[PDB]
Amino acid sequence: KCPKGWLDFRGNCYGYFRYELPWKRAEAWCRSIRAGAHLASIHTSEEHRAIAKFISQYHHGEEEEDVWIGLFRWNSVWAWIDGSKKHYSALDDDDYPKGKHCAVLDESSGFLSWDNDSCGERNAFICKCTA
């Protein structure tokens, strides 16, 4: 019983939205569009693969098509905004004092890599909710 247009994968529903919002506003929009939803957490490589395939089937702009997920940095540590425990990462985690504390799926790698972006930047986003 996933909403029309949402990905159904292993007990969860995922909604891809091309509305380009800053990270905190994207999280707020997810919570509002479906009861219990959040920016997506990703806990296995198979979940990651399914999400990338789902997004890649949509029509995109030429460039700058990164997609927010629910990973954010606070007190120097990355965590999921849905409160779930971390089990999987495709984020590089490198020597960055650049002030970029919110994660995206990177379009240039077919959403294979996660990158960190400034939380005020506008990006498309993907929501997740339990079925």
UniProtKB/Swiss-Prot annotation:
Does the record carry Disulfide bond as a key word? yes
Protein localization:
Secreted, Extracellular space, Extracellular matrix
Q: Which UniProt keywords apply?
A: Disulfide bond, Extracellular matrix, Lectin, Secreted
Major location (coarse)? secreted
Q: A single GO molecular function, which one?
A: carbohydrate binding
Q: Which SMART domains match?
A: CLECT (SM00034)
Q: List the disulfide bonds.
A: C2-C13, C30-C127, C102-C119
The yes or no answer to whether the keyword Repressor is present is no
Please provide, in alphabetical order, the Gene Ontology terms of the cellular component aspect for this entry: extracellular region
What residue stretches are annotated with the C-type lectin domain? 9-128
According to UniProt, the name of this protein is Struthiocalcin-1
Instruction: Give the source species.
Output: Struthio camelus (Common ostrich)
